[PDB]
Design a protein around this ligand. Structure first.
Ligand SMILES: N#CCC(=O)N1CCC(c2nc(-c3cccs3)no2)CC1
Ligand SMILES: N#CCC(=O)N1CCC(c2nc(-c3cccs3)no2)CC1
Lengths: 188, 188
């Protein structure tokens, strides 16, 4: 509860500054607590980002699970990719911080890797279902095609939300990715 | 010349250790020079990685220029993506280091961004040429389609070469990307 306040403070601060320019004293102060009381909840600011990413990742995973318990094929994929556009799009600071943190934090890398393996495995299953039903041609190995498409979405989403040059404009991202997914899944 | 030796030492060391676990004393020693003589050539180890990435990036850019001064459409794109698979594939350590460095080094980010804008702009031009000749349908904005495909290759190449979980196996990468590029460029 003082915990949530640390979390909300970190999320707020990461909007304007990297994690490197946020001190533990910054988190404690925004949360209305002392520095030692902070250390009772988190051993470090990295530990804060980790929890924030865990929440975001689980939120996208739960929304995708919701979707999976149920339009034409283009709209089907668009709704799925939209889960990630919206969830990560709603937590750009955290998303952006956690991506950069993969390169330093072994635990951030593991968290991200676990969830990506999951989303890939789900994409691959649907793609195999589409093949099984005769909707999609048996072209590339489904799991490798799934891997490349999910890596694309990851990089494209995060570049767009960060305003990186180069990037697809946020308002064009969803159409761009959907076109690529549908053509590479259903085409030959 | 003592310069090249620093560069070759860094490249060698980065094979087994991140840049964080390589000290300036490590670079000087492998190069057969003292620590102050090192500082004459580079103000920092980051400056070393920057130069190494510059070389790799320019090498892929020059190979792509070579290719551009000249098979069917699938083989055309496969040869282009192969330029990057092979060039980055031949410098995995540096490539891997420089990707992680984008997140900390403003200059590494600028170098990478400049070259990506260039490769995107070239992909977009060829795609527009393909449309102009009636080989490819006018679907998405060429420059946005180009952006997404090049971001995919970047992320997929680097994940594969790093042995990340998840990744496409290095021996399947080229086929995977080619399939995606050709279907999304020529399909509807
Ligand atoms: N980043 C990231 C992951 C991502 O963009 N996706 C795109 C959507 C993929 C996906 N949708 C589905 C759907 C099933 C039914 C409706 S939709 N099954 O898999 C999950 C990963
Ligand atoms: N990473 C990264 C960049 C990359 O993979 N590509 C793929 C190849 C793209 C490309 N090939 C061509 C070709 C023209 C003629 C033969 S081929 N024009 O553009 C450049 C960027």
């Amino acid at each position: 509860d003082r915990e949530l306040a640390i979390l909300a403070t970190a999320e707020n601060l990461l909007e304007d500054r990297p994690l490197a320019d946020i001190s533990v004293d910054d988190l404690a102060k925004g949360a209305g607590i002392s520095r030692p009381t902070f250390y009772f909840y988190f051993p470090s600011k990295e530990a804060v980002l980790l929890t924030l990413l865990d929440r975001v990742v689980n939120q996208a995973d739960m929304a995708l699970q919701t979707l999976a318990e149920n339009t034409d094929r283009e709209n089907m994929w668009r709704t799925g990719i939209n889960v990630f556009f919206e969830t990560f799009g709603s937590h750009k600071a955290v998303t952006r911080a956690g991506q950069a943190a993969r390169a330093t934090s072994v635990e951030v890398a593991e968290l991200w890797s676990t969830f990506m393996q999951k989303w890939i495995a789900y994409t691959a299953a649907v793609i195999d279902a589409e093949r099984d039903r005769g909707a999609a041609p048996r072209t590339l190995p489904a799991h490798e095609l799934a891997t490349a498409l999910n890596l694309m979405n990851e990089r494209t989403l995060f570049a767009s939300f960060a305003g990186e040059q180069p990037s697809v404009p946020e308002a064009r991202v969803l159409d761009t990715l959907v076109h690529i997914w549908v053509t590479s899944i259903y085409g030959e």
